[PDB]
Design an enzyme around this catalytic site. Sequence first.
Site, PDB file in Angstrom:
ATOM      1  N   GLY A   7       0.811  -1.224   0.000  1.00 19.65           N
ATOM      2  CA  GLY A   7       0.000   0.000   0.000  1.00 19.65           C
ATOM      3  C   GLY A   7       0.837   1.263   0.000  1.00 19.65           C
ATOM      4  N   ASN A   9       1.178   3.861  -1.851  1.00 15.60           N
ATOM      5  CA  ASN A   9       0.585   5.147  -2.205  1.00 15.60           C
ATOM      6  C   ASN A   9      -0.280   5.723  -1.090  1.00 15.60           C
ATOM      7  OD1 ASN A   9      -1.468   3.063  -2.641  1.00 15.60           O
ATOM      8  ND2 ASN A   9      -2.701   4.774  -3.415  1.00 15.60           N
ATOM      9  N   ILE A  12       0.388   7.383   5.146  1.00 13.57           N
ATOM     10  CA  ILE A  12       1.559   7.034   5.957  1.00 13.57           C
ATOM     11  C   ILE A  12       2.691   6.479   5.089  1.00 13.57           C
ATOM     12  CG2 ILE A  12       2.403   5.488   7.775  1.00 13.57           C
ATOM     13  CD1 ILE A  12      -0.385   5.765   9.115  1.00 13.57           C
ATOM     14  N   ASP A  57      -5.950  -6.291  -4.649  1.00 17.66           N
ATOM     15  CA  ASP A  57      -6.835  -6.593  -3.518  1.00 17.66           C
ATOM     16  C   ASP A  57      -6.167  -7.505  -2.498  1.00 17.66           C
ATOM     17  OD1 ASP A  57     -10.107  -8.235  -3.167  1.00 17.66           O
ATOM     18  OD2 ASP A  57      -9.066  -6.842  -1.837  1.00 17.66           O
ATOM     19  N   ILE A  58      -6.006  -7.004  -1.278  1.00 18.04           N
ATOM     20  CA  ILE A  58      -5.371  -7.780  -0.215  1.00 18.04           C
ATOM     21  C   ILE A  58      -6.330  -8.766   0.473  1.00 18.04           C
ATOM     22  CG2 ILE A  58      -3.527  -6.079   0.131  1.00 18.04           C
ATOM     23  CD1 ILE A  58      -4.962  -5.139   2.668  1.00 18.04           C
ATOM     24  N   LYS A 169      -8.190  -4.197  12.892  1.00 19.45           N
ATOM     25  CA  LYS A 169      -6.810  -3.947  13.299  1.00 19.45           C
ATOM     26  C   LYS A 169      -6.354  -4.970  14.349  1.00 19.45           C
ATOM     27  CE  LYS A 169      -4.676  -1.384  11.550  1.00 19.45           C
ATOM     28  NZ  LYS A 169      -3.898  -1.562  10.275  1.00 19.45           N
ATOM     29  N   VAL A 199      -3.283   9.892  13.205  1.00 22.13           N
ATOM     30  CA  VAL A 199      -2.125  10.384  12.472  1.00 22.13           C
ATOM     31  C   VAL A 199      -2.489  11.637  11.695  1.00 22.13           C
ATOM     32  CG1 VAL A 199      -0.260   9.756  10.878  1.00 22.13           C
ATOM     33  CG2 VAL A 199      -1.263   8.026  12.323  1.00 22.13           C
TER      34      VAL A 199
HETATM   35  N1  LIG Z   1      -4.181   7.431   9.684  1.00 19.21           N
HETATM   36  C1  LIG Z   1      -4.281   6.989  10.941  1.00 19.21           C
HETATM   37  O1  LIG Z   1      -4.720   7.827  11.995  1.00 19.21           O
HETATM   38  C2  LIG Z   1      -3.906   5.569  11.275  1.00 19.21           C
HETATM   39  C3  LIG Z   1      -3.667   4.610  10.287  1.00 19.21           C
HETATM   40  N2  LIG Z   1      -3.325   3.317  10.621  1.00 19.21           N
HETATM   41  C4  LIG Z   1      -2.978   2.307   9.608  1.00 19.21           C
HETATM   42  O2  LIG Z   1      -2.059   2.773   8.640  1.00 19.21           O
HETATM   43  C5  LIG Z   1      -2.255   2.062   7.435  1.00 19.21           C
HETATM   44  C6  LIG Z   1      -2.420   3.046   6.283  1.00 19.21           C
HETATM   45  O3  LIG Z   1      -3.470   3.944   6.590  1.00 19.21           O
HETATM   46  P1  LIG Z   1      -3.423   5.491   6.167  1.00 19.21           P
HETATM   47  O4  LIG Z   1      -2.175   5.761   5.412  1.00 19.21           O
HETATM   48  O5  LIG Z   1      -3.720   6.247   7.398  1.00 19.21           O
HETATM   49  O6  LIG Z   1      -4.724   5.687   5.241  1.00 19.21           O
HETATM   50  P2  LIG Z   1      -4.818   5.433   3.657  1.00 19.21           P
HETATM   51  O7  LIG Z   1      -6.237   5.259   3.264  1.00 19.21           O
HETATM   52  O8  LIG Z   1      -4.180   6.525   2.889  1.00 19.21           O
HETATM   53  O9  LIG Z   1      -3.993   4.067   3.431  1.00 19.21           O
HETATM   54  C7  LIG Z   1      -4.629   2.842   3.124  1.00 19.21           C
HETATM   55  C8  LIG Z   1      -3.770   2.061   2.132  1.00 19.21           C
HETATM   56  O10 LIG Z   1      -4.179   0.706   2.101  1.00 19.21           O
HETATM   57  C9  LIG Z   1      -4.575   0.352   0.791  1.00 19.21           C
HETATM   58  N3  LIG Z   1      -5.701  -0.586   0.816  1.00 19.21           N
HETATM   59  C10 LIG Z   1      -6.840  -0.499   1.571  1.00 19.21           C
HETATM   60  N4  LIG Z   1      -7.606  -1.571   1.279  1.00 19.21           N
HETATM   61  C11 LIG Z   1      -6.968  -2.332   0.360  1.00 19.21           C
HETATM   62  C12 LIG Z   1      -7.292  -3.524  -0.281  1.00 19.21           C
HETATM   63  N5  LIG Z   1      -8.363  -4.214   0.081  1.00 19.21           N
HETATM   64  N6  LIG Z   1      -6.415  -4.066  -1.194  1.00 19.21           N
HETATM   65  C13 LIG Z   1      -5.217  -3.440  -1.480  1.00 19.21           C
HETATM   66  N7  LIG Z   1      -4.901  -2.259  -0.837  1.00 19.21           N
HETATM   67  C14 LIG Z   1      -5.764  -1.718   0.061  1.00 19.21           C
HETATM   68  C15 LIG Z   1      -4.987   1.657   0.145  1.00 19.21           C
HETATM   69  O11 LIG Z   1      -5.026   1.624  -1.265  1.00 19.21           O
HETATM   70  P3  LIG Z   1      -5.792   2.810  -2.052  1.00 19.21           P
HETATM   71  O12 LIG Z   1      -5.225   4.153  -1.658  1.00 19.21           O
HETATM   72  O13 LIG Z   1      -5.599   2.646  -3.535  1.00 19.21           O
HETATM   73  O14 LIG Z   1      -7.260   2.760  -1.717  1.00 19.21           O
HETATM   74  C16 LIG Z   1      -3.934   2.584   0.713  1.00 19.21           C
HETATM   75  O15 LIG Z   1      -2.722   2.438   0.008  1.00 19.21           O
HETATM   76  C17 LIG Z   1      -3.507   1.213   7.617  1.00 19.21           C
HETATM   77  O16 LIG Z   1      -3.102  -0.122   7.839  1.00 19.21           O
HETATM   78  C18 LIG Z   1      -4.180   1.810   8.839  1.00 19.21           C
HETATM   79  O17 LIG Z   1      -4.882   0.872   9.605  1.00 19.21           O
HETATM   80  C19 LIG Z   1      -3.192   2.914  11.918  1.00 19.21           C
HETATM   81  C20 LIG Z   1      -3.403   3.787  12.973  1.00 19.21           C
HETATM   82  C21 LIG Z   1      -3.791   5.216  12.740  1.00 19.21           C
END
Ligand SMILES: NC(=O)C1=CN([C@@H]2O[C@H](COP(=O)(O)OP(=O)(O)OC[C@H]3O[C@@H](n4cnc5c(N)ncnc54)[C@H](OP(=O)(O)O)[C@@H]3O)[C@@H](O)[C@H]2O)C=CC1
EC number: 1.1.1.283
Length: 342
Positions: A7, A9, A12, A57-58, A169, A199
């Site tokens: 992920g 793009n 974080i 898709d994960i 989570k 975050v």
């Molecule tokens: N932001 C926050 O306050 C917090 C975030 N997190 C964790 O950090 C991680 C990233 O989140 P964050 O950067 O905040 O938010 P984002 O939505 O920007 O990041 C989510 C990422 O996961 C990918 N993704 C989601 N579902 C799928 C799927 N089914 N198949 C393939 N890829 C998938 C997204 O792809 P795409 O962009 O193309 O949809 C994207 O790259 C997550 O695991 C989240 O739980 C944890 C604690 C706090």
Amino acid sequence: MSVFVSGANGFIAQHIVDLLLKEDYKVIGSARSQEKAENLTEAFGNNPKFSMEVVPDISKLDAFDHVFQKHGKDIKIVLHTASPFCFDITDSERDLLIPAVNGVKGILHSIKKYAADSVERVVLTSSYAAVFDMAKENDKSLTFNEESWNPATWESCQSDPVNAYCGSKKFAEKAAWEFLEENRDSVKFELTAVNPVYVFGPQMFDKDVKKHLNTSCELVNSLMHLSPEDKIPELFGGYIDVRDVAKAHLVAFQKRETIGQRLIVSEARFTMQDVLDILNEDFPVLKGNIPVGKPGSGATHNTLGATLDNKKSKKLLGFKFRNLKETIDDTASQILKFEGRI
Ligand SMILES: NC(=O)C1=CN([C@@H]2O[C@H](COP(=O)(O)OP(=O)(O)OC[C@H]3O[C@@H](n4cnc5c(N)ncnc54)[C@H](OP(=O)(O)O)[C@@H]3O)[C@@H](O)[C@H]2O)C=CC1
């Protein structure tokens, strides 16, 4: 030697990719489409140390088979950050629980199958949602730490999407620890969980500032669009800047001492009042156009809930975190640059 970032793009993850490239790692990311992949490599200035793979898709347990099939020998570090954190969803089990859980089970199995002998470190982006008790955050007498777990079960967490997300989570993380238990002899890698609170901070690239942001940052974007007479959302939690979260991920694989640990990346507490106080003071263009509430009554001045004790994590990580003012300023100013308000 390469570092794989799932992920890549994401909000974080882009900051992680940034820090990895600056420390001279070869980096391989995944994104859901060729389009998003090409956009990401381009944004990073077509860095020859950076490449991308398409993993759509994960929720598919063999989603990461191809990347480890062809790169497993070269992959030394895996940072699994991909997980759904999206709320336009029809069904909690299917849109939150299954993809997050299968995402973890899948990538680890891909490692076992194709890279059991080369992958040295695995870091999982989990959450403080996997640690805390929602129904209890408001209680000043209780204390949460790295050893704390979310009490919710599969089924119980399905009551609402927010609870389901928190469960997802928890269960994705439990699955990672369970997989390492069940395969300890059969894999070389060590595991670390990184558990961020809310975050905040700027998007890696300005282009990615849009009308609506990633959900954690949308909370600030949303606040900045309320009128003075609008009601202030109720929210109490820890905060952390995204650049700090990204750095926590690097430290989590680089350090001996972070082997087998859960690392809560959290600076201190906030409520929306604390965010209003900052916005109002640092951005004259916002003062008079957003709510004021009761200034000074947020968590930057008052103990308002359970104690988040991440002192162990802070010591393991070994660097100091940005305060709320800094992280909120960077988020808000970047947004105002996109709105053309300065
Ligand atoms: N932001 C926050 O306050 C917090 C975030 N997190 C964790 O950090 C991680 C990233 O989140 P964050 O950067 O905040 O938010 P984002 O939505 O920007 O990041 C989510 C990422 O996961 C990918 N993704 C989601 N579902 C799928 C799927 N089914 N198949 C393939 N890829 C998938 C997204 O792809 P795409 O962009 O193309 O949809 C994207 O790259 C997550 O695991 C989240 O739980 C944890 C604690 C706090």
